[PDB]
Curated annotation (Swiss-Prot):
Covered range of the whole protein: 250 to 326 of 328
Native source species: Mus musculus (Mouse)
Subunit and interaction comment: Interacts with HCFC1. Homodimer. Component of the SIN3 histone deacetylase (HDAC) corepressor complex. Interacts with SIN3A. Interaction with SIN3B enhances the interaction between SIN3B and HDAC1 to form a complex. Component of a mSin3A corepressor complex that contains SIN3A, SAP130, SUDS3/SAP45, ARID4B/SAP180, HDAC1 and HDAC2. Interacts with USP17L2; the interaction is direct. Interacts with FOXK2.
Assigned protein family: Belongs to the SDS3 family.
Domain notes per entry: The C-terminus is involved in transcriptional repression by HDAC-independent mechanisms.
Protein name (database record): Sin3 histone deacetylase corepressor complex component SDS3
UniProt lineage: Eukaryota, Metazoa, Chordata, Craniata, Vertebrata
Amino acid sequence: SNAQRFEARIEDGKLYYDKRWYHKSQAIYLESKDNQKLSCVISSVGANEIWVRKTSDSTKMRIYVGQLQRGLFVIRRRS
C-alpha cells in the first residue's frame, strides 16, 4: 500500500507512529479540524488497535493502525 501519509504500526506492544514511539501510559494530543486537541492517555495497546482514554469523558477511543497510516488522526506525543 502506497496510500500512507503517516507511517504507523504496533511494535512489541507499543505504538510506532510518525516514526516516533509511544508508551502504553503515553499521554497524547489528538487534534483535527472538527476536533480540538484532546489530551488523552493510552490505556492499552492491542494488535491492530490502540485504546486511548479521554481524560475528561473517561470513555475509551479505539484507533486502528490502518486509520493512522492513512493519516486520519494527527497524534502528537507528550512524554
